[PDB]
Structures are given as C-alpha cells and as structure tokens.
Design an enzyme around this catalytic site. Sequence first.
Site, PDB file in Angstrom:
ATOM      1  N   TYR A 170     -23.694 -13.448  12.837  1.00  0.00           N
ATOM      2  CA  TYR A 170     -23.631 -12.088  12.393  1.00  0.00           C
ATOM      3  C   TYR A 170     -24.990 -11.605  11.894  1.00  0.00           C
ATOM      4  O   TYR A 170     -25.590 -12.203  11.005  1.00  0.00           O
ATOM      5  CB  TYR A 170     -22.599 -11.997  11.296  1.00  0.00           C
ATOM      6  CG  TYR A 170     -22.578 -10.672  10.567  1.00  0.00           C
ATOM      7  CD1 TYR A 170     -21.911  -9.572  11.108  1.00  0.00           C
ATOM      8  CD2 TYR A 170     -23.213 -10.538   9.300  1.00  0.00           C
ATOM      9  CE1 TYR A 170     -21.851  -8.383  10.426  1.00  0.00           C
ATOM     10  CE2 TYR A 170     -23.177  -9.343   8.598  1.00  0.00           C
ATOM     11  CZ  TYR A 170     -22.494  -8.260   9.175  1.00  0.00           C
ATOM     12  OH  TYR A 170     -22.447  -7.056   8.499  1.00  0.00           O
TER      13      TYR A 170
ATOM     14  N   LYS B  28     -30.419 -10.719   0.715  1.00  0.00           N
ATOM     15  CA  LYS B  28     -29.502 -11.174  -0.290  1.00  0.00           C
ATOM     16  C   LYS B  28     -30.177 -11.635  -1.580  1.00  0.00           C
ATOM     17  O   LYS B  28     -30.522 -10.804  -2.434  1.00  0.00           O
ATOM     18  CB  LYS B  28     -28.436 -12.057   0.356  1.00  0.00           C
ATOM     19  CG  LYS B  28     -27.589 -11.180   1.329  1.00  0.00           C
ATOM     20  CD  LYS B  28     -26.358 -11.737   2.125  1.00  0.00           C
ATOM     21  CE  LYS B  28     -25.523 -10.510   2.844  1.00  0.00           C
ATOM     22  NZ  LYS B  28     -24.611 -10.843   4.118  1.00  0.00           N
TER      23      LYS B  28
ATOM     24  N   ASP C 229     -32.495 -15.938  11.321  1.00  0.00           N
ATOM     25  CA  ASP C 229     -31.968 -15.021  10.327  1.00  0.00           C
ATOM     26  C   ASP C 229     -31.584 -15.768   9.075  1.00  0.00           C
ATOM     27  O   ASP C 229     -30.529 -16.455   9.058  1.00  0.00           O
ATOM     28  CB  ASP C 229     -30.764 -14.243  10.866  1.00  0.00           C
ATOM     29  CG  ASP C 229     -30.165 -13.362   9.841  1.00  0.00           C
ATOM     30  OD1 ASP C 229     -30.710 -13.392   8.712  1.00  0.00           O
ATOM     31  OD2 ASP C 229     -29.167 -12.668  10.151  1.00  0.00           O
TER      32      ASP C 229
HETATM   33  C1  LIG Z   1     -24.897 -10.090   5.229  1.00  0.00           C
HETATM   34  C2  LIG Z   1     -25.879 -10.676   6.250  1.00  0.00           C
HETATM   35  C3  LIG Z   1     -26.716  -9.801   6.967  1.00  0.00           C
HETATM   36  C4  LIG Z   1     -26.633  -8.360   6.674  1.00  0.00           C
HETATM   37  O1  LIG Z   1     -27.549  -8.018   5.653  1.00  0.00           O
HETATM   38  P1  LIG Z   1     -27.266  -6.791   4.663  1.00  0.00           P
HETATM   39  O2  LIG Z   1     -28.218  -7.020   3.565  1.00  0.00           O
HETATM   40  O3  LIG Z   1     -25.835  -6.936   4.324  1.00  0.00           O
HETATM   41  O4  LIG Z   1     -27.568  -5.605   5.465  1.00  0.00           O
HETATM   42  C5  LIG Z   1     -27.611 -10.269   7.955  1.00  0.00           C
HETATM   43  N1  LIG Z   1     -27.700 -11.611   8.293  1.00  0.00           N
HETATM   44  C6  LIG Z   1     -26.903 -12.513   7.627  1.00  0.00           C
HETATM   45  C7  LIG Z   1     -27.046 -13.975   7.997  1.00  0.00           C
HETATM   46  C8  LIG Z   1     -25.987 -12.056   6.606  1.00  0.00           C
HETATM   47  O5  LIG Z   1     -25.283 -12.870   5.995  1.00  0.00           O
END
Ligand SMILES: *Cc1c(COP(=O)(O)O)cnc(C)c1O
Lengths: 360, 360
Positions: free
Chosen positions: B110, B205, B177
């Site tokens: 995701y 985060k 990511d």
């Molecule tokens: C939640 C998440 C996102 C999205 O980032 P937001 O700060 O919620 O826009 C992207 N990549 C990963 C791995 C995530 O957990």
Amino acid sequence: PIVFDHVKGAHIWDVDGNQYIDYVGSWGPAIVGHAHPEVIDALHAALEKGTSFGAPCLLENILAEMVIAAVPSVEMVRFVNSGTEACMAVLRLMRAYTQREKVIKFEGCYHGHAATLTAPYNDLEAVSRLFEQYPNDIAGVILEPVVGNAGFIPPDAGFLEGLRELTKQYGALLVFDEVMTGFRIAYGGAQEKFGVTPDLTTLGKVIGGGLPVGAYGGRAEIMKMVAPAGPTLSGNPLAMTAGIKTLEILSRPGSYEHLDRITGKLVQGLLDAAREFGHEVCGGHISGMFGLFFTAGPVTNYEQAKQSDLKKFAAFHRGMLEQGIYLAPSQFEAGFTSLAHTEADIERTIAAARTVLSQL
Amino acid sequence: PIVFDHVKGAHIWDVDGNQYIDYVGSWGPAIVGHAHPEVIDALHAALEKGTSFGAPCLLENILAEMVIAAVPSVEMVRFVNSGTEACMAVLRLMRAYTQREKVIKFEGCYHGHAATLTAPYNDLEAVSRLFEQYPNDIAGVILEPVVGNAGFIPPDAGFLEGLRELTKQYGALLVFDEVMTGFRIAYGGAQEKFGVTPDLTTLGKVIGGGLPVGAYGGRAEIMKMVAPAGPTLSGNPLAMTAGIKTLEILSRPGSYEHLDRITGKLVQGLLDAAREFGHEVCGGHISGMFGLFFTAGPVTNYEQAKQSDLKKFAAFHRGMLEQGIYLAPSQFEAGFTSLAHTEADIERTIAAARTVLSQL
Ligand SMILES: *Cc1c(COP(=O)(O)O)cnc(C)c1O
Ligand SMILES: *Cc1c(COP(=O)(O)O)cnc(C)c1O
C-alpha cells in the site's frame, strides 16, 4: 527562496528578521489571523490529550454540527485528512449515487493532486452541450464557486444558477468545492452568499484552523450512501479543536463586514496605483479573497487570466517583497486578507504598491 | 464505533472511560508513546510561533540533516504533506530519472490512495520475468521492505538483495517505501537493518511525531532532478518540531532493543496462547512491528495472508477489546509496540489473549 521564522496576526517574520504583511494566509486557513491567542490556547489544552488518535472523537461531532448549521446543503458531513481527499471522496460519491461515470470540471479549477469532460469556467453553453451529448452519463459538475487557483475569478451572473438548472434537468449532481471559499467568502460559504445550493460540498482549509483537515457533506439521502461497505481516516483532534475555535471567532459580529471593507480598499488601491502609472490591470475581491491581473481583461476564465503579463507581475511581486509585503508568488493564486489586518496595514500596502509600480 | 477521549503513553481512554493498551500507535507514528512530555513541551513552544507557514523554515533543515544522517540511501531529502504525497513524488521521480514508464508494485503493498505491473510479494522470479520482458522500460520497483498493510509480512531471505540485483542489471531504480518501517524497524529503517540500499526512499509517520508529514530522498544525482521546473507544499513546522524530538528520543541508548524485547515476548505469548487452545496460527515481529495470522501459513505473501480465518480474528478482536486491549480491527494491518509499553503491559496482553482464545 524565503524562509519563515514565525507568523502572528497579519504579519510574517523571516529568518533574517524581516517583517512583512501577509496576503497569503498559509494559503487559506489563517482567516482570523496567524497565531490567534484563543486558538493557540485551545490547542495548548488539546495538545495534552494527544496530537493524534487515528480513531474518531467527540470533537468531530461538535465541528460537524457547527458545519451543518453553517452550510445549507450540508445535512450530513464526513471528515478526512485533507481537502484533496475530500474532493476524492466526493467524486466517488457522485458516481455511486448517480450510477454514472462522467464528471464535468472547468479548465483552471483545482481540486488537489473518458470519465472527465472539461469546459471553460463561466461557460454555461459548453456545459449545456456536454449534457445534450451525454444526457444519461454525467454524474455531476464540480467546481470552485469562486476561483482562487487561476488567479481570482468570480462567477458571472446566472452561471451557478445555470449549473443548478442543468444538473436538475439531467438528473446529475452539483458539487461545490469550498475548501477555499468555505467560511471565507461567507460563514455559509459561497453557496450561502450567492443563494445557490449544491447537492454536495467539500470543505477544508479554514475549518482545520491552520492544521490539515478536510470534509465533505450534502443532502442526507446522498451521504447515507457513505456506509459500512462501499464507498483510519478521521479528523485530527488538534485540527478539530482549532477549527471549532476559528468558526466561533468568525461567527462574532463584524467579521465578514470587516473583511469586505479592508479587501475592497486594498484591491481598489492596488487598481488605482497601477493605473496611476499607465498599467493595464483589473481585479476584484469578494469578502477576504481578492486578485489583480496584469491585463485589462476582464477575466472571467483561465485562458483570459493567461493573458496576464507575467514579467510585470514577477517584477511587482519582487518589488512588493522589498517593500515588506508578501503576496503569493504566482499571478494565478488569489489573495487573502484576515481579521487581524487593520486599515493601517492596508494603506501601507498601497503605499508599497505605488512605490513599486511607479518604477516599471 | 469506538470513540477516543485521550491517549498517553501506551494507553487509550474512550468516551465511556475505558482504558485500553494500544497496539495501533495512531497507525504508526506513536513509537515513543502517546503524548510524550518532551514532545508535547516542544510543541507548546512551537505552537506560539504559528501552527502553519505555507513556506519553508529552518526546522525543515534540522530534520533533513537528522534524516540524511540516519538513513543510508538518503543524501538529499524533500518534505511534503503526507506519506502518500511522498510516494507520488517518488513515482514521478523514478520516471523522469530513468525516462521510462513502467513501475513494479507487489500485490498487497500500500502506497496511499499499462504503466503499472504488479507481482506477488516475495516472488523474485515473477519480477525477473517482468524485466526479461520489458528490459528497457521499467523505471523501477517500489515496495514496502517489510509489509504492514497485508498483515505483517517480512522479506524472505535474498528477496531484497535480488531486487537490488535486477534493478542494477536493467538500469532501473529500487525504491523503498519506509513511511511505516522508517525509524520503526530500526533508526536507519529496514534498509539499514537488512543492509540493502535503495536509490530512493519515502518517509513519514514517525518523522511527523504524530502530525501529518512526508518525505522522499535518495542518491544526490537523482534528487538534483527535483529542481526549479519539472518535477506551497513544505513541512508543517509543528510536525517537524515533533519529528525532531521524536528521533532524538529514539537515538538514546536502549530504544530499539526495548522494542524487540517486548514485541518478541508479545508475539510469542500470543502464538503460545492460541496453540494452547488448538488454533492454527503463525506470525512474527521485527522490532516494534508485528502480526499474527489465523492460518498455519506461513505467510510470505498476500494471497497466503488471505487464507486467514476472518471470523476467528473478528471474534478475537472483539474479545480482546472487552479485555481492555486495542488491536487493529483488520487482520490485514500489522501491530505496533512503543517505548512506553512495559513488560507488565505485555503480560496483561497475553492474559487477555488466553482468556479470549480459550472461548472460541
Ligand atoms: C500509511 C502509509 C502510507 C500513506 O502515508 P500517509 O502519511 O498516510 O499519506 C504510505 N506508505 C506506507 C507503507 C504506509 O503505511
Ligand atoms: C488547496 C485546495 C484544495 C486541496 O486541499 P488540501 O487541503 O490542500 O488537500 C482543494 N480545493 C481547493 C479549492 C483548494 O484551494
């Protein structure tokens, strides 16, 4: 490359110690002025319960009812993380509701970052034609009821009334994007000010009091479709705390009259000062939202805005910066005044304007 | 429908007055515990300079250098508003850099909300095949180096090393990511922990300390391409203030060892307690990130995760809630421990687990 240190009221201070008068507003939210003490206090308190929950809280509700109360079309509302996100929710919604795929946007409008048809803004005919051609397949029409991302372009007479005629006529939705105009053009938003009601509305900027947030709402029968099963994403509690305080302040007597007053004076001065030196320009304001294009225009749409002399603007902008004034860097962003701005603040801004314009 | 009142440390309190032990962390950020006093203080101060600027500030830099210092691949970094946005910046970047269009994602990953090829996670062959077939048209491969949105799925031996072999071999980029794994799996992220270096990385985060924020970075020659002209969006100053404090705390001795300790105990207990009552389950943790699936598995990919008995999980979840434990509502979200969690906190969580599991 201008780097901020702090902001407060209608002012900004940079890392070199330069104070300016702000006409950006953090790009919309700062309507009651930067670092408003009552908001700041509300936040110091909230802060101690957690910067972030990931789940809902009572604040959502308090805000929700304030919103429903303030905006006509809104009978039910949902909060998300950004205005962009709200615009996306709302596009999924139009489509599920109507069970149709095509949506009409206007060239120049911005809703964040073939099933799309576009038309030029303020063009009531081109829209009508799209319906005549896809009678059963338009879910709706989405627009900024006042444009702030192609410069500042207000709606022509009969434009929005026309959009509400066609949507009805063809069983399609009228969606307003009021992330920017929300609570700025009027407490009820542009919908309430122009007395036209959409089926759906998006909200943001101001209602997060400077923190990021978004919301979408409208007719209940439509919103009911946002249900457990098609189509973590709740409102940040600080954002809500700030949104609530911000609106409280706005709903005091004098707010919107004050914005209109200073912004008219401001736009008018700017217009006088350019023409005082043979520059072709035009522009306007509605409440705390304004603009000035370097063309004679007028500007009722984006291609017209694109007429603007960008070399002049660039120069003006840079000039105004040295005069202690902070305007948006692009000719295609509208301006914003706040409740902190004083008539004194505005005159200085005009002085600046004259000094700068009498040298290009 | 569970509504929060406040959170602090490893606990959450609801509007009815129920305390729980949190294993969600506001979905990632809360690694040093909710409402950490040092962070909260940092914020009370920052708050008084403005909730929001719309332009850059020195904090961006302080954070940037902390990040560059902490993450290997990162030599240059840019901040944006969300992790989603960072993932989007990074996808535009891969493509401009390589001047190629196709990107490989894994089914289950995701990155927020044909030019896309997907493969199943941990499937080194399927990827290799995509290259053999589009030798000159893959810009890169983007992935969660540890999966947290399909439940918790770590990388198989040789998987990431394989991804770094192919990308090199075919002149394509390896993008990690680490919005979630960043500073959670390790200070250096999963890249640093598994000793594999991508060309680009996304962050979020934790680095916003509970406020929304995002960042993308990597090799300098690549990042230089983010220039004045192809391809308001700066870091919120409170978010940065919190990010900075958060990392400072994390870089103290004992942090990551503590997370590993409690999370192993926790996962292991959970695993023991289910099997104590004849349930087929498996799972694991890396540092403060963990998971437990209701299948014997093991789970190395999403289709395997989808084997999980969702009716059991649902029951377990609801059971654990009554036992004063707050786990993510979906079987497909991984868990999170924080520096506030105490060994005592964990035993209670196991007790709860046993009580609940010995009744399905
Ligand atoms: C939640 C998440 C996102 C999205 O980032 P937001 O700060 O919620 O826009 C992207 N990549 C990963 C791995 C995530 O957990
Ligand atoms: C800025 C803006 C958006 C985007 O909202 P974010 O809160 O920035 O995601 C959407 N619509 C309008 C009219 C905007 O001005």
